[PDB]
Amino acid sequence: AFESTRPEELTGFVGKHLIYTYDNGWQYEMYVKNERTIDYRIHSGMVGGRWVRDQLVHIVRLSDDVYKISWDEPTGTTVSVAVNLAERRLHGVIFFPQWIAQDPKKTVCFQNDHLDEMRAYRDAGPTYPKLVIDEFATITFMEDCGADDETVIACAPSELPAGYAARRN
Amino acid sequence: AFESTRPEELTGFVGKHLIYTYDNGWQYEMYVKNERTIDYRIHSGMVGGRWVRDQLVHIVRLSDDVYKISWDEPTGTTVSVAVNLAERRLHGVIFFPQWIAQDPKKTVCFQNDHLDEMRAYRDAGPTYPKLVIDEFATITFMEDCGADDETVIACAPSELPAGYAARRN
């Protein structure tokens, strides 16, 4: 299931830590913690407040500048993001089960301690139709943190220092 | 929902028709028929035989060489494919509902003649867990067919001239 993960192709991407705002105004944050893991943190929008550690991901090189990250969520959400490092742009496709569209705050939590709850909401549905978000984002802040830094994403977005998510480079 | 579709950015990609083989040996074919539509045809693998016309897609430009096509299927399957034209490399992530994994032949048809049946199988489930296929592919054949050529993918894989899927360029 992870035969596609090729670490020699990902050396320019593993360790990236990016804060980005989709064109719909939703502000997100991702840490590429290693070849098959991300942590992430949502700052604003439909599921603002949500954060996730140790999300297993498929990370692949599409070009020297462009990397993709895809994954399955215990909520039933499926996601594929692409990051263009040279142009400081991200693109997301997110396929949300209809239950999340109807009551997105149900997913707003530190998900790692609510996995049965997410699977319960997911099992109850509705599943269909998916709410499909297909959106470009601007990468406002990007830095290299190296691999396996447990400190990058280790608190809820409400508990960060004033100005954290607004920092740019 | 199609805000991200920007035809002016896709002129180098719309019209492409590619045959590709994933790393697991499954041989696929896609025609980018216009800015928001693909036809596709599956030659081998778990759902060899299956073909689809007029699939609504989200097509975006990630770089001058890299494009992304993402979609939601009436079976509940969600997909995101990326194509690097310069490298003749494709990558796909496919999230199949569990019911397809259990009996994939149920989806092996000209789907457009079986839409109610696909919605019925999708609604009965099971949905979870997804079977997630994440794989590179070799683009073995690529050509430019222009937009809205209704002849590129219009018959089953078994109704093509001998050697069609084996052609190389």
Numbering used by the authors:
A (entry chain D), B (entry chain A): 24 to 192
Sentences from the paper on this structure:
Enzymatic decarboxylation of biobased hydroxycinnamic acids gives access to phenolic styrenes for adhesive production. To date, several PADs have been biochemically analyzed and structurally characterized. PADs adopt the lipocalin fold, and the core of the protein is formed by two mutually perpendicular β-sheets. In solution, a homodimer is formed by two monomers that are related by an improper 2-fold axis. In this study, we used ancestral sequence reconstruction to generate thermostable decarboxylases.
To gain a better understanding based on their activity and stability, we determined the structures of N31, N55, and N134 via X-ray crystallography. The models for the remaining ancestors were predicted using AlphaFold 2.41 N31, N55, and N134 were crystallized with one, two, and three homodimers in the asymmetric unit at a resolution of 3.1, 1.6, and 2.5 Å, respectively. Also, the overall structures of the PADs were found to be conserved, leading to an RMSD below 1 Å if aligned to BsPAD. The C-terminal part (depicted in red) shows some structural and sequential diversity. N55 and N134 harbor an N-terminal loop (depicted in blue) absent in N31 and BsPAD that contributes to some extent to the dimerization (compare also Figure S4). All ancestors showed a highly conserved active site architecture with identical catalytic machinery. The residues corresponding to N132 and T41 in N55 originate from these helices. Both were found to form a hydrogen bond to the NH1 atom of the catalytically active arginine in all crystal structures.
